[PDB]
Amino acid sequence: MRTRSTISTPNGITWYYEQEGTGPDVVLVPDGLGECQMFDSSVSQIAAQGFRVTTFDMPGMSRSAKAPPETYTEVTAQKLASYVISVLDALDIKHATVWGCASGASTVVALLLGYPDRIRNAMCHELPTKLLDHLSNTAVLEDEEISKILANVMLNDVSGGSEAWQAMGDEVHARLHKNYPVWARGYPRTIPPSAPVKDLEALRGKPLDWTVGAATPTESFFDNIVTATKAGVNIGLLPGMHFPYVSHPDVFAKYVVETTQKHL
Amino acid sequence: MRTRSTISTPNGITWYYEQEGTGPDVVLVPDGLGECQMFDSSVSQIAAQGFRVTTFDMPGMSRSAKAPPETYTEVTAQKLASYVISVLDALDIKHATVWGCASGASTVVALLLGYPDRIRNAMCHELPTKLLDHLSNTAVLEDEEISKILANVMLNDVSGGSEAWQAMGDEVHARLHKNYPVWARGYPRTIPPSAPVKDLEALRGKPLDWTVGAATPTESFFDNIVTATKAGVNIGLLPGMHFPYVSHPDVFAKYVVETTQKHL
Numbered sequence: 001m002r003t004r005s006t007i008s009t010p011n012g013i014t015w016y017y018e019q020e021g022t023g024p025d026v027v028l029v030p031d032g033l034g035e036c037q038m039f040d041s042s043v044s045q046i047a048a049q050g051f052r053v054t055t056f057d058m059p060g061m062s063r064s065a066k067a068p069p070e071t072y073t074e075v076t077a078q079k080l081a082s083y084v085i086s087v088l089d090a091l092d093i094k095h096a097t098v099w100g101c102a103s104g105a106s107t108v109v110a111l112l113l114g115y116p117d118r119i120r121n122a123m124c125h126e127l128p129t130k131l132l133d134h135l136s137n138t139a140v141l142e143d144e145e146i147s148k149i150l151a152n153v154m155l156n157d158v159s160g161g162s163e164a165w166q167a168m169g170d171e172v173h174a175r176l177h178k179n180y181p182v183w184a185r186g187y188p189r190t191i192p193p194s195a196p197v198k199d200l201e202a203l204r205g206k207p208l209d210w211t212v213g214a215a216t217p218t219e220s221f222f223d224n225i226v227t228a229t230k231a232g233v234n235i236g237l238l239p240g241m242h243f244p245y246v247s248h249p250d251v252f253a254k255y256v257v258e259t260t261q262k263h264l
Numbered sequence: 265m266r267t268r269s270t271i272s273t274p275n276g277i278t279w280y281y282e283q284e285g286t287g288p289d290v291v292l293v294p295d296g297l298g299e300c301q302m303f304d305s306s307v308s309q310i311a312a313q314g315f316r317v318t319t320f321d322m323p324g325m326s327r328s329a330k331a332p333p334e335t336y337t338e339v340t341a342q343k344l345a346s347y348v349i350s351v352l353d354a355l356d357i358k359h360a361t362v363w364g365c366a367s368g369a370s371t372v373v374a375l376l377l378g379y380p381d382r383i384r385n386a387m388c389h390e391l392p393t394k395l396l397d398h399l400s401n402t403a404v405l406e407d408e409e410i411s412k413i414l415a416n417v418m419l420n421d422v423s424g425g426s427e428a429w430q431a432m433g434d435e436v437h438a439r440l441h442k443n444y445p446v447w448a449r450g451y452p453r454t455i456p457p458s459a460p461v462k463d464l465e466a467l468r469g470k471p472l473d474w475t476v477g478a479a480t481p482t483e484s485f486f487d488n489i490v491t492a493t494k495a496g497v498n499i500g501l502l503p504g505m506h507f508p509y510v511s512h513p514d515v516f517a518k519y520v521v522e523t524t525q526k527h528l
């Protein structure tokens with residue numbers, strides 16, 4: 001049985017969140033698009049091994065759109081880690097395993113470095129460290145231009161699984177549609193320079209497990225692989241590209257549970 | 265003015281080879297397909313910056329097909345390094361900068377480790393260290409079935425640039441056609457276990473520059489990036505996939521000259 005509800009935190013944000021299961025806490029942090037329905041079937045699968053799985057739309061996105069502007073403009077890993085700690089405080093989640101891709105990847109690493117007593121272990125996927133002009137440039141476009149371009153980039157290029165991406169269904173793509181412009185304006189200029197992965201030696205020894213997409217072109221996250229290896233941090237592959245929890249939910253969920261079990 | 269000629273080495277191989285320019289020696293070793301026409305426009309570009317550029321079809325391939333069977337069956341980095349040393353002996357090339365992709369990548373690092381006095385510096389691209397069963401399994405297919413499959417894999421998937429691949433023209437594709445089966449039967453089962461990168465500390469400090477394709481899916485040469493980083497070896501990207509000297513000849517040739525200049 002899945003809890004679907006809202007909860008507020010004193011930084012002005014009213015989070016849509018979901019939660020299933022009983023056990024050690026595992027938290028699934030969304031990617032830049034902030035849409036936690038992406039995790040839907042994995043939440044059930046992780047929870048069915050023995051875990052409490054919690055997830056939530058991110059601030060200004062989808063059903064957590066009721067939030068102040070500092071919360072989705074000039075976004076940084078450190079700001080997002082703060083937000084996620086706040087919703088963990090509110091849900092009384094004291095010690096959490098965390099997953100995150102993209103801006104969520106930067107969030108979970110910032111979580112791990114910033115709040116080490118809170119984080120049992122952190123799985124980051126495809127941590128954006130480099131400014132990409134094709135993304136940054138969309139921000140100056142009109143909202144509806146942005147949705148069209150980005151919806152298409154996800155559908156045809158980088159879902160890692162187009163049928164799975166389509167099958168999320170119309171409600172989700174209608175929420176995504178509204179999120180594309182707030183993401184485009186809030187994330188790509190300021191998320192990469194905030195990458196909390198320039199201090200190699202802070203990563204060393206930490207309980208951190210890094211993945212990249214198997215089918216993702218090598219240039220996108222080449223740098224993650226270099227950085228992990230310099231720092232001794234476990235690094236490997238999941239199938240797909242940026243959304244393995246959409247395209248390969250079974251392999252995704254198995255990986256989250258195995259990795260969490262490694263750290264109980 | 266380009267020398268196009270043959271020369272014979274005492275291991276039974278008659279090499280087709282080409283050579284242009286005057287300067288320090290730079291040697292372009294083909295990938296598994298053994299076809300040196302792939303380097304055509306680069307040979308002129310590299311040479312025009314004050315190098316003597318040499319290249320050749322590989323044994324049992326294209327115009328270097330007159331060779332004994334040991335030279336293109338159960339092929340290995342160490343065997344290939346031997347073969348190229350032999351043709352460098354014959355052409356009286358005493359010190360050489362070397363490039364190689366794929367089996368050529370393995371060859372040039374075996375060269376570097378095995379004949380250090382001979383190798384000024386080695387650029388290796390996409391060094392195959394893993395057995396792939398989809399490749400190994402083509403070997404039992406009918407020659408002509410292997411050509412069709414493999415011609416099509418290069419054209420549609422892994423060229424890194426279809427137009428450029430097509431533009432090489434009919435003569436080269438007709439030589440490739442014959443090479444695909446010799447390659448499939450000779451290389452994929454035995455080239456990877458011969459990977460001369462299991463001794464990390466032999467690589468350390470050597471004058472080696474490693475690249476992978478930018479557009480190449482991350483899983484194919486993930487392991488190169490890990491291995492280079494562990495060994496302090498310089499590692500970066502070129503555009504395209506397995507054949508940057510076909511798809512991006514300009515950036516290929518610039519990279520070979522810049523990198524060679526770093527080592528005079």
Ligand SMILES: C[C@H]1CCC[C@@H](O)CCC/C=C/c2cc(O)cc(O)c2C(=O)O1
Pocket residue numbers: 031032033101102103104128130132153158183187188189191192220242
């Ligand atoms: C929203 C996803 C879209 C993936 C598109 C994907 O194809 C582009 C992948 C590289 C960029 C991801 C990205 C980069 C940033 O600077 C900030 C981010 O929040 C992301 C990120 O979350 O990417």
Ligand SMILES: C[C@H]1CCC[C@@H](O)CCC/C=C/c2cc(O)cc(O)c2C(=O)O1
Pocket residue numbers: 295296297365366367368392394399417422451452453455456484506
């Ligand atoms: C000729 C190309 C095949 C291109 C398909 C290419 O996409 C196949 C995947 C990469 C591996 C290539 C490879 C592997 C080996 O064990 C030995 C080899 O000589 C190669 C190699 O030369 O690769």
